[PDB]
Amino acid sequence: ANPYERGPNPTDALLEARSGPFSVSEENVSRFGADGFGGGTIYYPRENNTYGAVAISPGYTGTQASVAWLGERIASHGFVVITIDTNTTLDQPDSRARQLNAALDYMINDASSAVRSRIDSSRLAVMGHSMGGGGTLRLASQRPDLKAAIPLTPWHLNKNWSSVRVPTLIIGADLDTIAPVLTHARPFYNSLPTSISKAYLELDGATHFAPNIPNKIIGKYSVAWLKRFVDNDTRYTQFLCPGPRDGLFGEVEEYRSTCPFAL
Ligand SMILES: [Cl-]
Ligand SMILES: [Cl-]
Ligand SMILES: [Cl-]
Ligand SMILES: [Mg+2]
Ligand SMILES: [Mg+2]
Numbered sequence: 350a351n352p353y354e355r356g357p358n359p360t361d362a363l364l365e366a367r368s369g370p371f372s373v374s375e376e377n378v379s380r381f382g383a384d385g386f387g388g389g390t391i392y393y394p395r396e397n398n399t400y401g402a403v404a405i406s407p408g409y410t411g412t413q414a415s416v417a418w419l420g421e422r423i424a425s426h427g428f429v430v431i432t433i434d435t436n437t438t439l440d441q442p443d444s445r446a447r448q449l450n451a452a453l454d455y456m457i458n459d460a461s462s463a464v465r466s467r468i469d470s471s472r473l474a475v476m477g478h479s480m481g482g483g484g485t486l487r488l489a490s491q492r493p494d495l496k497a498a499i500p501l502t503p504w505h506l507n508k509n510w511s512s513v514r515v516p517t518l519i520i521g522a523d524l525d526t527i528a529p530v531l532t533h534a535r536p537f538y539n540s541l542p543t544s545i546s547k548a549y550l551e552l553d554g555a556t557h558f559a560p561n562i563p564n565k566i567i568g569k570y571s572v573a574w575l576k577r578f579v580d581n582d583t584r585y586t587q588f589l590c591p592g593p594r595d596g597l598f599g600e601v602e603e604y605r606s607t608c609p610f611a612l
Pocket of ligand 3: 535539
């Protein structure tokens, strides 16, 4: 048993649905209301409880709209989630890392009392697309207290993430020509320590922009990872260990992990 558990006992179908069981409210954060980042939208459960909190960054030239579906879907499973805009859409990964940090702090300290009262500030995670995924890796390396990190088709010039101790799921796309998995996602995964909880899910038949529209697989494994690591929710281990089979056409190219994952 576990005091951080929220929602019903899961199934694959529950994780694959357009919405989880929680009712999602939205709070707008304008550019000038956000100290240290470009604003965003906070998605949060209307059900009064405390939940973990997650910040999600888009990539270069991207806005919060490119990750909105995923922020809302995650929130609907019982999380407080901010999808950010960056100070400029030209910001590099290490700047996005600090803006993700600022967005976590915003949710904890600067958002409405409705949002702040629903956050367990000790249980935080970060995610991001492309350069936002590079920023996710950088922030994970700077903040070992984070509970989870999910880089989506990540891009970063630094290939060595051996300092990261945060449970990290990297999602790559086999056809990606912008952040090719051979030179980005795979080197990142291979450099993460063998001794941390980590997984690499490479989508088959998928482009760099697979994370930017509703995707059953990305939603399912993102939610399961956050449940397992932000909530310590062992009801979600079954989806992650051993995880999906390799070689599923148009779905999963491969799934690697360090299963079993320690609490
Ligand atoms: Cl990018
Ligand atoms: Cl592509
Ligand atoms: Cl590899
Ligand atoms: Mg709603
Ligand atoms: Mg601002």
